[PDB]
Each structure stands twice: as structure tokens, then as C-alpha cells.
Amino acid sequence: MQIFVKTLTGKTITLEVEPSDTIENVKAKIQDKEGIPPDQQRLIFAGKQLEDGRTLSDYNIQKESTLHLVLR
Amino acid sequence: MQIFVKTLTGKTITLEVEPSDTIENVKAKIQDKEGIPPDQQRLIFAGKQLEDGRTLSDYNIQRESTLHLVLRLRGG
Amino acid sequence: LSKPGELRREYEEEISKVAAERRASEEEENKASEEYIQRLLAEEEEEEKRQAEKRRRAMEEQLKSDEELARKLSIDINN
Ligand SMILES: OC[C@H]1O[C@@H](O)[C@H](O)[C@H]1O
Ligand SMILES: [Mg+2]
Ligand SMILES: [Mg+2]
């Protein structure tokens, strides 16, 4: 399952995830591509900021959904 | 043997088959002809969905029988 | 009576409509996120301006207080 993460600079990165992944997993995957430590990452989907312990399926995030990255 | 396949929008195609052909075989023939992936196809005959591992003879499909085709439509 | 690709072309048209609905659904999602971010950054910009303004007034009042002490001092050390 592929999703997109958009940064404030406007670039889009692609992530390979599963519905079971937590938001904390996703921040780790963003770390691996961008080098941004997870504790500086805020993730937003559908106008709401996502919580570390919850899962992608908890937020109805599905393939080709777009998450938005805003740094602390 | 010729059989007919029909969709819910009224369209009918003709397929050349043998009674020993499996339903998986039939769905592959429909793919080669109409470009519809077998996993997007559902076939119906005599009030039941036809399973991939069974043959046309298993469902008593004969010359000029008409199957119904239901498409699974997928953006996802 | 399906001509070469007639069922094929209905399938492609119907897939296209499913894709267009996903894009429409995603647009509502992405506009909520983009308006959320706009608000969040505006609220963090206003907060930092309030903090910097608080710092400015504290420094300005320290200056006045320092002058008050300095005058009491200069009058004491020169007469
Ligand atoms: O939580 C998001 C929901 O809002 C719409 O995009 C869809 O109905 C759901 O995915
Ligand atoms: Mg890592
Ligand atoms: Mg083939």
C-alpha cells in the first residue's frame, strides 16, 4: 500500500505501508527518507493531526491518501 | 461449443469453449478478448456464482447457454 | 453483440469514473489538511510575535528603571 507525504516545500515523497502500521511507524519511514527525527514530525490527514499510537486504518488512510508533514 | 456472456448493461459476447474448460479458463478467455482482469470478473449461471476450479459441465452449461458477467470496478 | 473492445471500452470508462470519485474524495481530504495547516502556522506566528513583544516591553522597562537608578547614583557621586 502506497501513500504520499507532502512537505511544506511542496515536494511529495512516497511511502510503502500497511493498514496496520502506526503513525509512529510512518514517522520512522519518513525519517529513513528525509532524515527528520520523528519527534520533530507532525502528520496531518483530512484536516486533523494524527496520533502516534493509532494505526493508518484507524484514520481511514488508504492507498494514494496524502499525509501532510509539518515540522514542530 | 459457443456460449454467450452478458453484462448488466445489456452487452453480449460469444466465446468458443469446451465443457471440460474450467471457469478460470473461461475468465482468461474473456480477458484475452475484452481486457478485463479475471479477478475483476464474476460469472453467474442458474442462480449461482461459478467457482474458478469447476468446469462448464459441472454447472450444466451447454451449447448457446448464457452466462451473466458482473464486473468488479476498482480504483483503489 | 459486442464489437472489438465495446465491453473493453465500457470497462475503461467505468474504471475512469471510479478514479474520478477517488480524486474528488481526496480533494476534500487535502483541502481540510491545507486549511488546517494554514491556521496552525498562523496561530504559531501570532504566538511568537506575542512572545517577542513581551520581551521587547520588558527590555524597554528595564532601560527606564536603569536610568532611574543611574540618576539617583549620579546625584550621589557628584554632590
Ligand atoms: O476519514 C476520512 C473520511 O472522509 C472522506 O474522505 C471519506 O468518507 C473518509 O475517508
Ligand atoms: Mg530508521
Ligand atoms: Mg491472457
Author numbering:
A (entry chain B): 1 to 72
B (entry chain C): 1 to 76
C (entry chain A): 110 to 188
Task: Quote the passages of the study that discuss this structure, keeping the authors' original sentences.
In the current model, the E3 Ub ligase RNF168 recognizes these polyubiquitylated proteins and then ubiquitylates histone H2A, which serves as a recruitment signal for 53BP114–19. Recognition of ubiquitylated products by RNF168 relies on three distinct UBDs: MIU (motif interacting with Ub) 1, MIU2 and UMI (Ub-interacting motif [UIM]- and MIU-related UBD). Currently, it is postulated that UDM1 and UDM2 interact with different ubiquitylated targets: UDM1 is associated with RNF8-dependent polyubiquitylated targets, whereas UDM2 recognizes RNF168-dependent monoubiquitylated targets. In UDM1 and UDM2ΔC, the simultaneous interactions with Ubdist and Ubprox provide the specificity for K63 chains.
